[PDB]
Design a protein around this ligand. Structure first.
Ligand SMILES: *[C@@H]1O[C@H](CO)[C@@H](O)[C@H](O)[C@H]1NC(C)=O
Ligand SMILES: *[C@@H]1O[C@H](CO)[C@@H](O)[C@H](O)[C@H]1NC(C)=O
Ligand SMILES: *[C@@H]1O[C@H](CO)[C@@H](O)[C@H](O)[C@H]1NC(C)=O
Lengths: 319, 319, 319
């Protein structure tokens, strides 16, 4: 009865593995998603000399209107009131002992301005070639050991995610609407305790991504909040819930270069254009929503059955 | 002749259903899309006291450069010239009858600043704990019954969408280039009259999404403009046109919380940093482009035929 | 031996074409990607009268924090210190010889403000209807023949792209980490010389997209940098590298309208709100990352084999 043994193996594969395990009787379908991230949290910096400085959702969220891939500022370097005048160059670009060593015109590489050919003093001692550009130039030589926005670990990230599968015309929201009047705005996400709460503490998000928040709070980083949908639409639609997973992107063996984009707050004072050059060492959260809806379709079901007869056929022939 | 009857059912399924109906002889392929949204429209607000205030594409579009998921401001609450000084707190955060009820330091939850421990008067009567923060604090207690930007319903949304299917190396534009010199910039999209015109009135977009514009114009909302491509590349490439569909995202039983992001216009006056805190109740339009190109490929065609022989086989065996 | 000849053709198709050529023994899977674009480059404009004007990564990148679809400003038209007062209208909107020809209220189409009904002089000769709006109005009548930011062709676009295939739990970075201490920051991308260097010169990107940079530098354009991943995860993960391809989106027979979005730099002077209306003729780079990981899966392998037996079956029956 070797045929029966061979046929049983084929029958197990078609039913147990393809259908029961691999869900081969359903047509997988992707989703188009819309993510609305809402942040709550205020961070004070206690900056010496200047004093405390608060930062609300309008100031530490890039873009302000929110996006799938947004940035939460955790640290920054500010150059107050930059103007396009004549000043020294940063030593990293170049140094000079006399005006004869300063080549007129913009530098070939690492250019910070129009080198006028004059050697002026960036430091009390170090003298760098005068350049036409944003003055004073961005020093960017020290990163505050305690992150200026260190409180951002307590910031709550409310993610309002709406997905839809065009093939099956099924629309789902990351809010399962099981909340009650008292439970309203009284949950924080946890991988075990509250897997369905869409409110994420940033410190918890970074921690569950394998990255220490204090390391990312200073130099910046990128965290991928993958909202994974695995709707088995053969069942009821309420049984499909998002599975939030956090990944440390650009880890580089858990030593990331740190997300350190630069943005300016342009303003005009006394009729002269100025700007506030912020080198923001923020944590960029990317809501990489992925989905695979498995709904019973007669095409994969019957092709597998036909495949099975082919699988069963070839097998018994060989034996 | 029961075999012929069973075989006919299988033959109908393979040809009529899989091939003719389900297009099982073609390899479905997704697309990578690029969306360039152009808006035309000016909205006046006729704000009492201040007077009229115009809002052009530079001011009511977030982001300004445009994106797949952008926001069109339909209403806003403005806090003019916020400064990081010492003032009262919003009553929602907390209230106080005396300085002894104000806990020094930042509040555990619903924190709006650094509570100095002093109880000062937010209202003529209500007294809230003094907090270091953006002053004056955002009241956010009244929403203009007529939306400040109510004219946005007449705003035209010109969507320049370029898609491409990497598998088939076919590039398509939502502009079928059937326009003529006179027809240029003389069409508005309609689900029946002009299904191919890429210029969408925002009032029409919201209306066709099942949401009343006046409701969304005040508190904000999210509208999903799904540009659906269903190219049957077996035919000519000109026969593939976008199918624009509008969906009300986060409807919550047609009672949305309203998209109400906050952004600031930072500026410096008299050497002091200020900002204009706008709580924008805009309508966020997400251009969720989805595509499935069906081009004749020998792999799905012959696997179905092989599946068919398996389907036909198993059937006649059972009978 | 016609059967053997027919069987050989089927056997070649199943193995040679489906498996060896079309990789029909592997389950294709898409990827969720995160793109971090870093730009280096300073552009001077040598604007007559005003003088030189520098533009760094903080000023010519939209959005500042970076995104998959970002804009690099190559040209702009600036309207300094626009205010919401009473001034003339642009002639394109309308003209007038007397106040009786100016209809009070906002214009039905091409409206630039609240027409007060008075006919004032936009030009020394041309007289247009006074409108309440941003004053002075955007002329937008001349485009600098040499692009103000023409140096942007030398700008280096460092693209830090992290992808991941959720089905196979494989994370990849566009950085293959073959760099050495000396090679660090010493490469530029080339289609042949350096196919793996993630640093792209913008002039090279536009040139390889089939578009002349000088044409796009003036009126703007859209360039699609498709980072294509084709991981054959059956092999080692190091053998999968990104394939960068540049496409000219919205070419319109290689005559693009030019990406010409508008953004404003709002500021307050003397207690009055102003803005700097920039019509940016930038080049919008869209990082359209696409991926198809082929990893050996028993489902496509055995269904093809079963399909084959069906293919082989039907064939020999016909003959
Ligand atoms: C001299 O310039 C360098 C720039 O790298 C800076 O780090 C250093 O602090 C300066 N020295 C002093 C005494 O300020
Ligand atoms: C008192 O404060 C509340 C804050 O909720 C505000 O709504 C109300 O208008 C204030 N009362 C007066 C008389 O201004
Ligand atoms: C008159 O206005 C038009 C607006 O289209 C402008 O192009 C032209 O230069 C103006 N004439 C003068 C002499 O400024």
């Amino acid at each position: 009865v070797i045929f029966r043994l061979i046929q049983l193996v084929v029958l197990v594969y078609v039913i147990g593995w393809v259908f029961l395990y691999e869900k081969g009787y359903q047509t997988s379908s992707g989703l188009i998603s819309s993510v609305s991230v809402k942040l709550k949290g205020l961070a004070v910096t206690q900056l010496p000399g200047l004093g405390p400085q608060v930062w609300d959702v309008a100031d530490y969220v890039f873009p302000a209107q929110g996006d799938n891939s947004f940035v939460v500022m955790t640290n920054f370097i500010v150059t107050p009131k930059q103007t396009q005048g004549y000043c020294a160059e940063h030593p990293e670009g170049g140094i000079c002992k006399e005006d004869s060593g300063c080549t007129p015109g913009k530098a070939k590489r690492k250019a910070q301005g129009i080198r006028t050919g004059k050697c002026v003093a960036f430091n009390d001692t170090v003298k760098t070639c005068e350049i036409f550009g944003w003055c004073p130039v961005e020093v960017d030589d020290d990163i505050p050991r305690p992150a200026l926005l260190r409180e951002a670990e307590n910031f709550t990230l409310f993610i309002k995610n709406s997905i839809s599968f065009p093939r099956f015309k099924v629309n789902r929201r990351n809010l399962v609407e099981e909340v009650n009047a008292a439970h309203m705005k009284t949950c924080l996400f946890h991988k075990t305790l509250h897997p369905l709460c869409p409110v994420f503490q940033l410190g918890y998000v970074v921690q569950e991504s394998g990255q220490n928040f204090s390391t990312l709070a200073e130099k910046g980083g990128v965290v991928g909040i993958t909202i994974d949908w695995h709707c088995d639409l053969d069942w009821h639609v309420r049984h499909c819930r998002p599975i939030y997973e956090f990944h440390g992107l650009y880890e580089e063996k858990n030593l990331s270069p740190g997300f350190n984009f630069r943005f300016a707050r342009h303003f005009v004072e006394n009729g002269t254009n100025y700007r506030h050059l912020f080198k923001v060492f923020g944590i960029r959260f990317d809501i990489l929503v992925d989905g695979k809806a498995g709904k019973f379709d007669i095409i994969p079901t019957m092709t597998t059955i036909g495949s099975g007869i082919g699988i069963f056929g070839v097998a018994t022939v060989l034996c």
